[PDB]
Design a protein around this ligand. Structure first.
Ligand SMILES: Nc1ncnc2c1ncn2[C@@H]1O[C@H](COP(=O)(O)OP(=O)(O)O)[C@@H](O)[C@H]1O
Ligand SMILES: Nc1ncnc2c1ncn2[C@@H]1O[C@H](COP(=O)(O)OP(=O)(O)O)[C@@H](O)[C@H]1O
Lengths: 370, 91, 370
């Protein structure tokens, strides 16, 4: 049973899906489960009472949105099962789970219990013929067409700098933080309350994400922007009322570089990138500096790459050629790589078959990934 | 007794120094069994050792090395120097 | 010019005033500006047509009362200027604003524009020599004598939990809601309409507050009280007519713990107290649980502390010593600490002088507070 395999690229913020050997993921939607706050009085209302994807985006105000996955670690397993069922259902894929092999993705260095429980869901609840979990950085390099280079990424949950050199993903040199787009959105929400405009509701939380996506920019010199007084630019909400954003827009994405502002000890994106290069061998450092690939949604801030280049110039040894490259479609970089990896004839060897899982168990899944 | 040693000397030194003393009681039976029994004792001990040596230190050293000096203060805010130079405590 | 400074502890419901070094605030009155509904035909009437303090409390029925403050955030600035002018006037303090330095208070995580506009009023309209703005939680601990511990408060506007450890108010663990005494009084009013007795007028609203102050208890088990049938206890209005209150008295203060009743997905008091302790660090949690201080008027319900203990037992980790301490004068706990802070000699260093404000501006006020 070697049908066209499916590539479900997981993520805390957004979840991508579709078939192998494709240019773009056809099925992209945000990873959450909306449920109705209000009392459904009238007959002929929205049926089901568990909303995922575009229906939930259309009907935000009704639904109490909650995310199942934080920092690449699922909290609510029943919610992720409903999301995966919605992916396979007629509203999105129009396929059965029994036909196609599965390509899953996860952030590196996660708890193994969650990886085991993920496999249990795919093999038992769904009747998958073969499963395969993989890295995000390895796929992003397959999407670009390079083998050597570091992959800095920044989704909604995790930020991790994975160094790879000619098909050798060093498991030891992988740096990681639990600081990312969701924490930046939460930090921007806190700043908007300091400005004046309070947002506490779960449906109203996605307006803060929309403001973060649209009206934000990362300054090169933060001390210079602190001394100067801001212009206070405007933005229209979904309702109609205008909001002067003020200094919150530029101080919000500083969290990624300065993790002390939220109140939690971490390295930072720029430190993690330097740190992933340093932990590798001495001969391979200069090739890793030359090939730095960006990925994820939280790398799309204005003057983000320029700030990363300046931070590398400050920390790294002098007289070294720095190059932070990036693809055009930074959001769909990991999925394209999975679609390429799935289309290859080698893919049959790597996967965990259902028969092999039934015989061995979790140990076979731990062996095949690394 | 089981001793590890690692030494890194770039930009300054770091050393790993270790040992585990083990006392065990085994019962002799066959040549095939005694050959595969002692090895089994070594295999499990040296793995448990490496496991602890790798997995405890990556996390527990990070927390015990942090219990001595923390990465950020008890407030989790970078200390304000202006605050330090114009504030009074006590009674 | 280092005269005996004035401590104006601002509050949404009640405002406290007096001089530094005293045991109690001598001048306490409700924070509103009453203005006459009816037309004045006859001579020898109440002159001025702007009523603040005991005159407004005496003659409620005449006056269309409106509160300037809402959730620790002043909406009507002209009304607060008139209140502050009334505080300093001969009817209350009998002093000039020119002589004495001013200690002011505000809730945490408020609009910075309101803090600037507060400072502008005190420095320009009044001619203050030196101003200082402070938190409520820091002062309450100064009043008790402790340094460490959490301060849960529940005024008329804001419920906020701030954890402090050895004279270090933790900014990143500050939890806050806009659910408080005024919202409980508004929720009680809505419940009394469901019972039968409506109170639509603004002068008539203070009858609902008086009912809330006297006849409201917090039951330990809400599901058990819902299943049982109430006794329907009586209450006499200022007119003389009887009111059978019924189940509205015990379901009214449930708003603070269950904010889902008003139609506003918030945490609640007990969750805010747990969240403030959890956001702070692992080493400080057990000391923060042992030192929990209560303040504000909406902590004065019958069986409030007993319910807050039971909710902490439900949420917090097991086998930990819980202690919710409470002073005798909870309404004046924040003012007492301000009077103590003002009496100390180090208060001279902390304040913002008039000369320093004229030179720098708002930036110096933002620096000195934190
Ligand atoms: N243009 C943008 N500017 C800033 N942030 C963005 C932008 N687009 C998306 N984001 C943020 O990045 C997140 C999407 O990142 P993504 O890589 O899809 O996460 P994951 O790796 O978990 O799938 C969103 O939740 C959003 O907050
Ligand atoms: N005994 C009481 N029982 C219940 N509620 C009370 C009681 N006393 C006062 N309140 C409520 O608390 C409010 C006073 O809160 P206060 O301590 O002045 O806080 P703030 O200074 O933040 O206004 C009043 O408006 C009233 O509604």
């Amino acid at each position: 049973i070697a049908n066209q395999p499916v590539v479900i690229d997981n993520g805390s913020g957004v979840i991508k899906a579709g078939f192998a050997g494709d240019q773009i993921p056809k099925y992209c939607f945000p990873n959450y489960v909306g449920r109705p706050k209000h009392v459904r009085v009238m007959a002929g209302a929205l049926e089901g009472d568990i909303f995922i994807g575009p229906k939930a985006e259309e009907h935000r105000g009704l639904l109490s949105i909650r995310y199942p996955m934080e920092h690449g670690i699922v909290k609510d397993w029943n919610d992720m099962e409903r999301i995966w069922q919605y992916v396979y259902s007629k509203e999105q894929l129009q396929t059965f789970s029994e036909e196609h092999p599965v390509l899953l993705t996860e952030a590196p260095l996660n708890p193994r219990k969650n990886r085991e429980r993920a496999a249990e869901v795919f093999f038992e609840t769904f009747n998958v013929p073969a499963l395969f979990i993989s890295m995000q950085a390895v796929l992003s390099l397959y999407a670009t067409g390079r083998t050597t280079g570091v992959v800095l990424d920044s989704g909604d949950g995790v930020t991790h700098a994975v160094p790879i050199y000619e098909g050798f993903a060093m498991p030891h040199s992988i740096m990681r933080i639990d600081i990312a787009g969701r924490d930046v959105s939460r930090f921007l929400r806190l700043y908007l309350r300091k400005e004046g405009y309070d947002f506490h509701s779960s449906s109203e939380f996605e307006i803060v994400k929309a403001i973060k996506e649209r009206a934000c920019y990362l300054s090169i010199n933060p001390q210079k922007d602190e001394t100067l007084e801001t212009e206070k630019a405007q933005y229209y909400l979904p309702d109609g009322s205008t909001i002067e954003i003020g200094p919150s827009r530029f101080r919000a994405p500083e969290l990624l570089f300065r993790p002390d502002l939220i109140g939690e000890e971490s390295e930072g994106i720029h430190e993690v990138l330097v740190f992933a290069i340093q932990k590798s061998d001495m001969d391979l450092r200069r090739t890793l500096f030359s090939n730095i690939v960006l990925s994820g949604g939280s790398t799309l801030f204005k003057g983000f790459g320029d700030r990363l280049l300046s931070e590398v110039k400050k920390l790294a040894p002098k007289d070294v050629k720095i190059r932070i490259s990036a693809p055009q479609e930074r959001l769909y970089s990991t999925w394209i790589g999975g679609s390429i990896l799935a289309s290859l004839d080698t893919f049959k060897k790597m996967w965990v078959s259902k028969k092999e899982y039934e015989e061995d168990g979790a140990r076979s899944i731990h062996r095949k990934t690394f | 007794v089981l001793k590890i040693q690692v030494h890194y000397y770039e930009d300054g030194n770091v050393q790993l120094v270790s040992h585990k003393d083990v006392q065990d009681s085994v019962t002799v039976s066959n040549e095939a069994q005694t050959a595969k029994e002692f090895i089994k004792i070594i295999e499990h001990a040296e793995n448990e050792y490496q496991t602890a040596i790798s997995e405890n230190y990556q996390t527990m050293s990070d927390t015990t090395f942090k219990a001595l000096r923390r990465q950020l203060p008890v407030t989790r805010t970078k200390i304000d120097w202006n605050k330090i130079l114009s504030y009074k405590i006590g009674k």
